[PDB]
Structure formats: C-alpha cells, structure tokens
Amino acid sequence: FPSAVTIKSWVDKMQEDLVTLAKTASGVNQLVDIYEKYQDLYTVEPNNARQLVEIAARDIEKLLSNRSKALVRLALEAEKVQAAHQWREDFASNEVVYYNAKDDEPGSQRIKPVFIEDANFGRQISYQHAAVHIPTDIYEGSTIVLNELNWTSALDEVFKKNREEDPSLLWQVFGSATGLARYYPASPWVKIDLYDVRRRPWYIQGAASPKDMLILVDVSGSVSGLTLKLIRTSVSEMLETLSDDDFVNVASFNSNAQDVSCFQHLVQANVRNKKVLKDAVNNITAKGITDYKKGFSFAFEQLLNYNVSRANCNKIIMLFTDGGEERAQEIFNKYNKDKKVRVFTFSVGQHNYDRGPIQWMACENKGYYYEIPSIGAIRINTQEYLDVLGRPMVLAGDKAKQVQWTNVYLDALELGLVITGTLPVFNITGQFENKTNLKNQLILGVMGVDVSLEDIKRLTPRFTLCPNGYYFAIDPNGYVLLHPNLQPKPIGVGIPTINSQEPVTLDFLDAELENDIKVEIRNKMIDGESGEKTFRTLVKSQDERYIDKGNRTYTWTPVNGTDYSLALVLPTYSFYYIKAKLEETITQARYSETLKPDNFEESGYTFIAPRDYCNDLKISDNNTEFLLNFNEFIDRKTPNNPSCNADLINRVLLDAGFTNELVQNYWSKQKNIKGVKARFVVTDGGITRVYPKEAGENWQENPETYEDSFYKRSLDNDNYVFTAPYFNKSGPGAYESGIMVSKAVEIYIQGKLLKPAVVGIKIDVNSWIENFTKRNSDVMDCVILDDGGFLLMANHDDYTNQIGRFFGEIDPSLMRHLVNISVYAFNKSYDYQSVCEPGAASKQSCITEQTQYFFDNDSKSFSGVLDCGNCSRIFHGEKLMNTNLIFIMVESKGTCPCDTRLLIQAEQTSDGPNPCDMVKQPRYRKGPDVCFDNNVLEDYTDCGGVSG
Ligand SMILES: *[C@@H]1O[C@H](CO)[C@@H](O[C@@H]2O[C@H](CO)[C@@H](O[C@@H]3O[C@H](CO)[C@@H](O[C@@H]4O[C@H](CO)[C@@H](O)[C@H](O)[C@H]4NC(C)=O)[C@H](O)[C@H]3NC(C)=O)[C@H](O)[C@H]2NC(C)=O)[C@H](O)[C@H]1NC(C)=O
Numbered sequence: 022f023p024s025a026v027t028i029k030s031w032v033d034k035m036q037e038d039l040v041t042l043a044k045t046a047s048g049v050n051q052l053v054d055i056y057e058k059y060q061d062l063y064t065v066e067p068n069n070a071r072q073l074v075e076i077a078a079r080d081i082e083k084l085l086s087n088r089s090k091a092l093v094r095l096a097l098e099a100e101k102v103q104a105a106h107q108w109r110e111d112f113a114s115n116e117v118v119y120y121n122a123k124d125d126e127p128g129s130q131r132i133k134p135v136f137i138e139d140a141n142f143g144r145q146i147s148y149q150h151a152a153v154h155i156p157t158d159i160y161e162g163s164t165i166v167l168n169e170l171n172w173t174s175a176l177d178e179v180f181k182k183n184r185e186e187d188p189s190l191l192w193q194v195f196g197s198a199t200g201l202a203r204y205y206p207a208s209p210w211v212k213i214d215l216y217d218v219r220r221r222p223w224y225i226q227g228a229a230s231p232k233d234m235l236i237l238v239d240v241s242g243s244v245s246g247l248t249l250k251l252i253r254t255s256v257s258e259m260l261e262t263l264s265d266d267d268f269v270n271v272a273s274f275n276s277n278a279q280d281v282s283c284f285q286h287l288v289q290a291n292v293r294n295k296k297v298l299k300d301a302v303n304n305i306t307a308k309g310i311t312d313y314k315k316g317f318s319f320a321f322e323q324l325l326n327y328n329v330s331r332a333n334c335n336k337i338i339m340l341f342t343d344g345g346e347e348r349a350q351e352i353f354n355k356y357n358k359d360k361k362v363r364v365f366t367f368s369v370g371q372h373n374y375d376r377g378p379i380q381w382m383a384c385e386n387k388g389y390y391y392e393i394p395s396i397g398a399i400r401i402n403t404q405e406y407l408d409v410l411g412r413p414m415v416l417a418g419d420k421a422k423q424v425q426w427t428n429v430y431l432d433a434l435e436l437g438l439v440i441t442g443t444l445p446v447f448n449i450t451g452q453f454e455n456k457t458n459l460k461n462q463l464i465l466g467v468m469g470v471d472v473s474l475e476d477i478k479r480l481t482p483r484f485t486l487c488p489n490g491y492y493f494a495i496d497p498n499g500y501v502l503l504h505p506n507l508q509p510k511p512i513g514v515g516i517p518t519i520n521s522q523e524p525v526t527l528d529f530l531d532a533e534l535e536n537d538i539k540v541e542i543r544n545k546m547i548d549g550e551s552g553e554k555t556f557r558t559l560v561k562s563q564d565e566r567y568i569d570k571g572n573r574t575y576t577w578t579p580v581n582g583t584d585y586s587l588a589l590v591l592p593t594y595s596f597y598y599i600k601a602k603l604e605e606t607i608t609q610a611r612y613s614e615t616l617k618p619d620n621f622e623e624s625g626y627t628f629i630a631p632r633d634y635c636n637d638l639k640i641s642d643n644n645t646e647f648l649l650n651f652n653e654f655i656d657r658k659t660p661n662n663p664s665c666n667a668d669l670i671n672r673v674l675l676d677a678g679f680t681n682e683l684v685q686n687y688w689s690k691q692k693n694i695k696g697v698k699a700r701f702v703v704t705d706g707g708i709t710r711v712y713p714k715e716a717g718e719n720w721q722e723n724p725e726t727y728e729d730s731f732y733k734r735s736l737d738n739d740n741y742v743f744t745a746p747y748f749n750k751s752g753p754g755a756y757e758s759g760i761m762v763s764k765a766v767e768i769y770i771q772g773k774l775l776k777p778a779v780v781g782i783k784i785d786v787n788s789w790i791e792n793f794t795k796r797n798s799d800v801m802d803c804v805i806l807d808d809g810g811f812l813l814m815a816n817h818d819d820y821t822n823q824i825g826r827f828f829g830e831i832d833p834s835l836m837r838h839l840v841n842i843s844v845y846a847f848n849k850s851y852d853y854q855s856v857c858e859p860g861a862a863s864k865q866s867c868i869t870e871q872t873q874y875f876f877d878n879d880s881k882s883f884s885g886v887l888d889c890g891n892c893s894r895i896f897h898g899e900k901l902m903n904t905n906l907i908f909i910m911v912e913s914k915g916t917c918p919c920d921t922r923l924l925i926q927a928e929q930t931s932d933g934p935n936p937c938d939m940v941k942q943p944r945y946r947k948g949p950d951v952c953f954d955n956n957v958l959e960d961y962t963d964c965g966g967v968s969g
C-alpha cells in the first residue's frame with residue numbers, strides 16, 4: 022500500500038494529462054474565441070420570465086376561450102333543435118340518413134363517405150358529415166335511437182361552422198344519454214368493441230357534480246355463489262365511474278360492519294386508492310347473518326367524519342344486496358331525518374328473496390333501485406345513478422353550465438394525449454310555456470371538444486431558451502397538464518401479475534425530483550397566485566443515471582379563464598440568448614452550402630435537429646432524408662418565407678457558419694491524434710458535427726440538441742464531464758468508440774454568461790488504459806469511477822472487459838462502504854409511466870423504482886479501512902480536479918474472500934409508495950367550489966321498483 026503523497030502525484034499527473042488532452046483536442050478556447058470575435062452577426066436578448074409566462078398563459082386562455090365558445094354554440098343549437106321535435110313512431114318512408122361508424126335494418130339509410138387523408142389526425146377523415154357510434158349491445162333502428170338520430174342530424178351544420186371558424190379544431194362530439202355519440206369530423210371507428218359514451222370521463226364529469234360515494238356490500242351467508250362474483254364485478258365497475266374529484270370508501274356488513282381495506286375513511290378515489298379498493302373487494306368471503314341497521318349506522322357515521330379532505334358535495338350510500346326483510350326505519354329517521362343523503366340500492370343475482378324493503382329504502386331517501394341479475398346487466402346498471410344526481414344540476418338552470426376540462430387522457434380514436442371541454446345539454450321541450458317538467462329533469466347528453474397537448478405545447482416555445490429550462494402547467498388537483506417528463510402512455514399501478522381507459526394523472530411531485538421547496542411552490546400554484554422563486558435544486562439527467570446540483574428559478578402565474586397554473590423553469594446562464602441578425606444573402610449562402618451531405622469528408626459528418634422550422638418541411642427522424650429535405654428547401658426557397666419563421670433558420674445557419682470555422686481552421690489541421698477516436702461539437706442552433714467519418718455511424722446520440730443528456734449535464738457543470746457507455750452489448754461504443762468527454766463553452770459579450778454550445782471528444786479506451794498502466798496486479802486493484810459510480814478504468818483486465826457498469830454491481834462490499842461514509846449520496850424515485858415484463862401469478866405498465874448516485878461532500882481526499890470480517894482492507898480515493906472523476910485503490914477481492922449481495926442501480930420494479938399511510942397525510946389539493954344537490958323542486962317520486 023503506497024503512501025498518500027505518491028498517489029496524489031499520480032492522480033495529479035493523469036488528471037493534468039486528461040484535461041490537457043481534452044482542452045487541446047476539443048478546442049474549447051478556439052470556439053470561445055470564434056464566438057467572441059464576431060459580435061456583429063448576432064445580438065444578445067434577455068429572457069425575462071415574468072412576461073414570457075404571462076404571454077404563454079394568455080395564449081392558453083385564448084385557446085380555451087375559442088373552445089368554450091364552440092362548446093356554448095353547440096349546446097345552444099342542440100337544445101334549440103331538440104326542443105322542436107315531434108317523436109314520430111315510424112320510420113318506413115321517412116328514412117334517417119347518417120353515417121354509422123364501424124361498418125365495412127329497416128328505418129334508416131347509410132352514407133358512404135370519401136375519407137380523404139388529412140393531417141392533424143392519424144387517420145382518414147371526411148368533413149362532409151358527422152359519424153355516429155352506437156354501442157354493440159344497443160340496437161340501431163329502434164324508436165329511441167332513430168328519434169335521437171333524426172333530431173341530432175341538425176348538429177352537422179354547427180360542427181361545420183365551428184370547424185370553419187377555427188381550422189385547428191379537433192373532435193367535436195355529442196354524447197347522448199341514449200348511448201350513441203355523434204362526432205365530427207367523420208372517421209371510421211378504431212376484436213370486439215366495448216366502447217360506451219356514458220362511461221367516458223368527460224361525460225361522467227359533465228353529467229353531475231363531484232360525489233362522496235360510500236358502498237355497502239352485503240357479505241352475509243345468502244350472497245355466497247354467483248351473486249357474490251356479480252357483486253364484486255358490479256362494485257369494480259362502479260368504482261370505474263369515479264374520478265379524482267370524487268371520494269369513495271367501501272364497507273361490508275354481516276351482523277357487524279367494517280371497512281374492507283386499510284383506509285377507514287373516504288379517500289380521493291384516484292388510481293392507487295381505486296386499485297386498493299378493488300383488490301380488497303376481490304378478497305371478500307360470504308358468511309354470517311345480515312344486519313341492515315349496523316351496516317347503515319356504519320355508513321352514516323362514515324359520511325360525518327369531516328376530519329379529512331372530502332368533496333362536500335353529493336353524499337350517497339350505494340347498497341349492494343340480494344333481498345331482505347328489514348326496512349330499518351329507525352336508522353334512516355335518526356341519521357338523515359331531513360333526507361340530506363341519497364341511498365341507491367342494488368339487488369344482485371338470480372334469487373327469490375323479497376325486494377320490497379330494498380325498493381322502499383331507495384324511494385324514501387331520494388335514491389333509486391336497480392336489478393343486476395347477470396354479467397350483461399352490470400355495465401348499464403352501474404352508470405344509471407348519474408341520472409338521479411343530475412336533477413339538481415338541470416333544476417339550477419343556466420348557472421349550471423360551465424365549461425370544465427378533464428384530466429389528461431389518451432384519446433379513444435388514437436390522437437394522443439388530449440383534454441376535453443365539457444358542457445351539459447338540457448331537455449327544454451315544453452319549457453317555452455313551462456308545462457312538462459316531468460322528463461325535462463334529465464340531461465339529453467354532453468358536449469365535448471378535444472384539445473391535444475401538442476396544441477398547448479405549440480404556445481410555449483422552448484428553442485429561445487437553454488435545454489435545461491421548460492414550461493409546466495399544473496391542475497388544481499396537483500397533476501401536470503404539461504411537462505417534459507409526461508409521456509403518452511398510461512400510468513402504472515403495482516406489479517403486473519397474471520395467471521388504457523384510465524386518465525394519465527401524474528402529480529407534479531412525481532414528474533420530477535421532490536423537494537421541500539417544490540411542495541411550497543406547488544401549493545402556491547394550486548390555489549392560484551403569481552410568484553417567483555430562485556433556489557438550488559438537484560436535477561436528474563435526461564437518462565435516469567445521473568443527478569447534478571444546479572440553480573433554478575421557477576416563475577409561475579395563474580391562467581385567468583381556467584384553473585390551471587403555468588410555471589417556467591429557467592436556470593442561470595440562460596437569461597440571455599443569441600438572436601442572429603443578418604439580412605445579407607451572400608453570407609446566408611456561404612453558410613448554407615456548408616451542410617452538403619456529399620461534402621462531409623472534410624467538414625465532418627453533420628447531423629441536423631429535426632425541428633419544425635415550418636409547415637413545408639416535414640420531419641422524418643432519419644436525418645439523412647431530413648437533411649436532404651432541409652438543404653433542398655434552403656437552396657430552393659426565397660428568403661421571404663410567407664409562412665416559415667426564419668429565426669430558427671437564422672440561428673441554425675449562424676451556428677453552422679461558426680462550426681464551419683471551428684472544424685476547418687482548427688480540427689482539420691490535426692487530422693489524426695493518438696488518444697482520440699472522435700471529436701464532436703453540438704450547438705443550440707440545432708446541429709452537431711463529428712469529424713471522423715467512420716465515427717458518424719457510431720454517434721448514438723439523438724439529432725435534437727435539446728434531447729441530449731450529455732449536453733444538459735455539461736451545461737450544469739463548469740468542468741469536463743465524462744459519460745460512461747452503456748453495458749452488455751447495446752450496440753457499438755464499448756470498445757470501438759471510447760469514453761465520451763464533453764465541455765460547455767462560456768461566452769462573455771457584454772459580461773453576460775452565455776453557453777451557446779458544447780464540444781467534446783471520445784478517448785480511445787486502449788490508449789487510455791495504456792497511459793493508465795504507466796496491470797493485472799493480483800495484489801491490489803486501482804479503478805476510476807465517475808459521478809455516479811460507473812466503471813471507467815480497471816486494472817485486472819476482466820473488469821476492463823465490462824466497462825461502463827455500476828461499481829456496486831461488481832464490488833458491492835466497497836460500494837456500500839463508500840455510500841456509508843458519505844462520499845456518495847443517493848436518491849430514489851418512482852417512475853409510473855414504465856413498461857416491464859410480467860410475473861408468475863408481452864409487457865405491461867408498472868411502477869419502477871430508480872436510484873441515482875452523486876457526490877455527497879465537497880472534500881476531495883478520502884482514506885479508510887473496510888472490515889469485512891476476518892479481514893481488513895485499506896482503501897484510498899482522490900477526486901480528480903476540474904472534472905467529475907475519482908480514483909480509488911483497494912486490495913484485490915481475493916485477499917478477503919467476502920462478497921455480500923450485489924448493489925444494483927437499475928430499473929427495479931416495485932409498487933411503492935404504500936397508500937395506507939399515504940392517505941393519512943395527503944398532498945394539498947383544491948376542489949371545485951360549485952356543488953349542485955338537494956334542490957327543493959326535485960321530483961324524486963320515481964324509483965326503479967315502482968315501474969318494475
Ligand atoms: C324531453 O322531454 C319530453 C317531454 O318532457 C320528451 O317527450 C316525450 O316523449 C315520450 C316518448 O318517450 C312521449 O310519450 C308518448 O306517449 C306514450 C308514452 O311512451 C307512447 O306510447 C307507448 O308508451 C310505451 C310506454 O308505456 C312505450 O313502450 C311504447 O313504445 C309507446 N308507443 C307505442 C306503444 O306505440 C307514445 O308513443 C309517445 N309518443 C307519442 C304519443 O307521440 C311523450 O308524449 C313526449 N312528451 C312530450 C311533451 O312531447 C322527450 O322524449 C325528451 N327528450 C328525449 C331526447 O327523450
């Protein structure tokens with residue numbers, strides 16, 4: 022074991038060699054000088070967040086205002102047209118003409134459309150008319166459906182008017198209480214089809230107000246058998262009808278009432294809680310004697326908690342029995358004396374018990390009685406309770422017409438992530454003279470208009486700011502409407518164990534790394550108020566392997582019209598951006614004919630960022646086709662560009678010109694360098710250049726500058742950054758490309774700190790380990806790790822074979838000791854939008870736990886002794902200056918024959934966090950302030966038992 026002085030000398034020598042090699046081959050100062058000398062082809066412009074966030078908020082508000090105007094127009098026309106209807110009972114000669122979707126009966130005709138291919142949709146559409154979807158188990162050609170089709174045939178004119186007034190308009194849909202949906206533009210529908218309009222989240226949120234559902238399940242002996250599996254399926258289907266604004270709990274009684282799970286009070290009824298409740302209700306067994314009084318007392322006591330967050334709206338008890346003999350007048354009289362709580366009752370299964378008390382309990386408490394004798398009746402009967410809850414909303418009048426917006430969800434017609442604006446439609450036939458009032462207390466249906474998240478993203482440009490900043494909008498529930506980490510895939514729950522109809526609800530604290538200041542900012546945004554806050558965060562890298570600490574500023578404002586709150590995340594060194602200023606065509610050409618694909622042998626292989634410069638250029642991500650399209654467009658277009666913004670074009674041409682001088686004047690002079698296998702440069706303008714042509718196909722980086730992990734990692738740091746290659750044959754790069762090293766250039770025009778681009782090289786691994794040797798020493802091992810504990814240097818030539826691997830996966834004994842002595846800190850997180858292989862009980866959605874390691878303390882020297890039992894191994898470690906590299910030595914693994922379980926840093930599937938103790942102290946949220954219930958003029962004189 023050598024002393025500390027010699028090891029410090031070796032570390033200093035090799036770190037100076039590496040820094041000098043990188044500074045010379047990359048040419049950081051040469052590019053800095055190139056950027057510094059011109060100062061005339063461009064200018065420096067501020068990035069003042071306070072007006073940027075407000076401008077983006079105003080744009081989002083205007084978009085939502087257009088959508089709300091269209092919704093109001095559609096609702097008004099639908100009400101007016103349905104008011105003047107005749108209800109004809111025959112359709113023999115008066116045929117109904119409509120285009121039925123999902124097609125390749127007497128009473129109606131069929132339309133054959135043209136179906137031209139059109140953009141903004143991933144399918145073939147027709148603007149000539151509207152398509153109609155009728156669920157499979159609903160017969161088209163009956164009197165109800167034919168009358169509905171006839172009176173809804175008049176909505177196509179308003180669909181066309183809305184589309185003409187705003188071409189950038191997606192689906193417009195009328196969802197009927199009959200069951201059909203008429204949507205525009207007409208498209209063919211997407212095995213068997215189980216789509217039902219009345220089960221959709223937008224229809225459900227528009228059909229009533231939030232609720233406080235409580236489900237009583239009878240688990241006595243008489244429900245054993247098929248009337249128990251039907252009860253379980255019905256409870257699951259009814260839980261499927263709730264949302265994040267509704268609060269639910271499930272209780273079961275057999276001579277004694279108790280909660281079926283760990284909750285013990287109403288919960289937010291989100292994905293995790295609903296999954297827990299479904300799992301709990303799947304585990305109930307039937308035994309005992311029914312006692313309605315105890316179960317109803319439990320249910321009534323559960324709705325008077327008020328110590329927990331609730332909806333403070335519709336309070337309903339949803340009883341699931343077969344048939345009893347007790348009416349329990351005392352419990353109903355005692356608890357809801359004034360009938361402030363509704364009681365819906367369900368009789369499940371095929372049996373011969375008495376249904377009288379069930380119907381009486383439904384009728385005496387503003388409720389409704391339903392019969393579910395088979396599986397086929399489960400879906401319809403578990404969604405009809407929204408008709409009863411909608412009576413106070415229709416009786417409210419025009420005050421109960423407010424455009425609401427759903428959570429982010431995947432469109433049924435394969436359009437991506439969308440939100441839906443919603444407006445209910447009322448039945449007002451005979452309300453001109455105000456005489457019917459009998460069936461006019463139910464809604465006709467729901468208006469819907471879809472807004473894709475790409476439309477919202479188009480209103481928040483990000484190319485005028487560094488790849489680190491971004492925008493994000495937050496729901497008053499804490500979910501993110503817009504975020505870089507949000508993905509177009511359903512969020513996972515638990516672990517998929519087997520023998521996308523849910524909303525994509527991702528919380529703000531789950532999209533990025535949580536912090537004590539993140540919670541404060543999120544709470545300040547949820548209630549709604551402008552503000553700004555600068556602080557120092559620890560940020561995860563684009564690839565989930567690194568964490569680095571950097572300064573950030575969050576500037577947030579509320580959107581006026583809606584309840585979303587929009588915030589901009591902007592780091593330092595990005596308050597100023599380079600804006601190209603040039604109107605001379607000669608320099609534009611001298612820059613443009615640099616990017617010729619057949620002229621890369623001397624200019625290096627060039628990659629273009631597939632940015633949407635304008636509509637004429639269509640991205641392809643091949644970057645060979647796209648580069649040819651780009652330079653053909655540049656060489657074949659006049660600079661007028663009627664609908665093609667040149668600011669991106671100006672920036673990319675200016676950066677191409679800068680890179681041309683960087684490559685020709687400096688890189689070309691030294692064609693070959695010993696310890697270099699590739700030299701690369703990436704810029705914010707949207708290009709990268711790799712000098713070796715043979716390294717062009719080994720450049721496994723995304724062409725877009727803003728999506729490169731190493732770019733942002735180098736921006737955050739102020740020193741050279743190493744990147745460990747991926748492990749276990751993920752292609753080329755382990756031995757044939759080398760270790761990638763990057764460094765970001767800093768520019769001072771008027772003293773402002775600017776980072777327009779990054780440079781870097783790829784050290785040849787063979788020459789680098791050869792310089793390291795000056796090998797196979799069985800006495801001691803000497804390795805180099807990066808910030809993250811990934812292997813970069815080895816000594817035994819077997820570890821060298823497996824490079825770019827986590828240190829703990831091969832030598833956990835010393836990795837755990839390093840973590841213990843606080844030389845590496847680590848943080849874990851949950852990824853909910855991940856797919857994985859299932860397990861014993863294709864790939865499915867799951868929650869995966871991720872771990873990331875980073876430097877703990879600012880100290881640079883460490884030494885100590887590891888006691889692994891019956892041995893004692895001394896170890897030393899020094900962090901290389903002006904980089905993120907550490908050199909550590911210890912005795913060989915053979916000296917002490919101990920090997921504990923290996924420390925894995927990877928995508929570990931899990932199911933955390935536990936929701937039983939998560940609901941004890943829930944996150945802050947704000948609920949809607951509009952509640953419609955207990956209207957005095959409610960009829961409520963009809964249940965499901967009097968008619969049947
Ligand atoms: C909006 O509300 C209005 C009223 O507020 C509503 O208009 C009413 O529609 C019903 C149809 O459901 C009309 O009922 C008429 O009278 C009976 C009752 O259904 C029908 O005769 C048979 O009734 C049995 C039910 O026992 C039924 O099974 C059978 O199919 C019916 N027909 C037969 C046997 O041939 C009449 O056919 C029916 N229609 C007539 C007489 O033209 C009410 O008269 C309507 N009320 C008013 C004031 O117009 C309207 O439907 C609601 N909107 C929507 C979208 O439903």
Ligand SMILES: *[C@@H]1O[C@H](CO)[C@@H](O[C@@H]2O[C@H](CO)[C@@H](O[C@@H]3O[C@H](CO)[C@@H](O)[C@H](O)[C@H]3NC(C)=O)[C@H](O)[C@H]2NC(C)=O)[C@H](O)[C@H]1NC(C)=O
Pocket residue numbers: 102115116171172173174175
């Ligand atoms: C529900 O279905 C009804 C029958 O299919 C539709 O009623 C028909 O509408 C036609 C045009 O809208 C009418 O044609 C003309 O109507 C005017 C109105 O006063 C009159 O000049 C004549 O009745 C007629 N003119 C002619 C034949 O030259 C039909 O008379 C009328 N009734 C029928 C066919 O029995 C409804 O329009 C439809 N509802 C909706 C909302 O579309």
Ligand SMILES: *[C@@H]1O[C@H](CO)[C@@H](O[C@@H]2O[C@H](CO)[C@@H](O)[C@H](O)[C@H]2NC(C)=O)[C@H](O)[C@H]1NC(C)=O
Pocket residue numbers: 326328
């Ligand atoms: C919370 O709910 C409980 C019952 O669910 C309410 O009742 C009190 O609970 C606390 C707990 O020790 C004690 O004060 C008494 O046992 C209960 N009665 C009274 C009169 O306090 C309680 O009031 C609710 N609110 C709070 C803040 O606990």
Ligand SMILES: *[C@@H]1O[C@H](CO)[C@@H](O[C@@H]2O[C@H](CO)[C@@H](O)[C@H](O)[C@H]2NC(C)=O)[C@H](O)[C@H]1NC(C)=O
Pocket residue numbers: 535536537559846847848
């Ligand atoms: C992420 O960063 C570190 C990872 O170890 C942890 O933060 C530390 O939390 C303790 C708890 O009291 C504090 O005393 C330290 O000062 C924190 N370190 C800092 C702020 O650098 C933790 O795992 C994560 N930090 C969070 C969740 O705030």
Ligand SMILES: *[C@@H]1O[C@H](CO)[C@@H](O[C@@H]2O[C@H](CO)[C@@H](O)[C@H](O)[C@H]2NC(C)=O)[C@H](O)[C@H]1NC(C)=O
Pocket residue numbers: 074075078079578579580581
């Ligand atoms: C939302 O509306 C409020 C008020 O309606 C806007 O508040 C403005 O605030 C600035 C400075 O704080 C004032 O100079 C304006 O006069 C206020 N507006 C009005 C109408 O008085 C707020 O800016 C709006 N939100 C956004 C994002 O613009």
Ligand SMILES: *[C@@H]1O[C@H](CO)[C@@H](O)[C@H](O)[C@H]1NC(C)=O
Pocket residue numbers: 080081083084087186187
């Ligand atoms: C629609 O919204 C945009 C902002 O996104 C606004 O400029 C425009 O005036 C609105 N109306 C129409 C008809 O485009």
Ligand SMILES: *[C@@H]1O[C@H](CO)[C@@H](O)[C@H](O)[C@H]1NC(C)=O
Pocket residue numbers: 749
């Ligand atoms: C990837 O998994 C292990 C991890 O080191 C590796 O040894 C193995 O060779 C790789 N899998 C295959 C099929 O080669």
Ligand SMILES: [Ca+2]
Pocket residue numbers: 241242243244310311
């Ligand atoms: Ca019983």
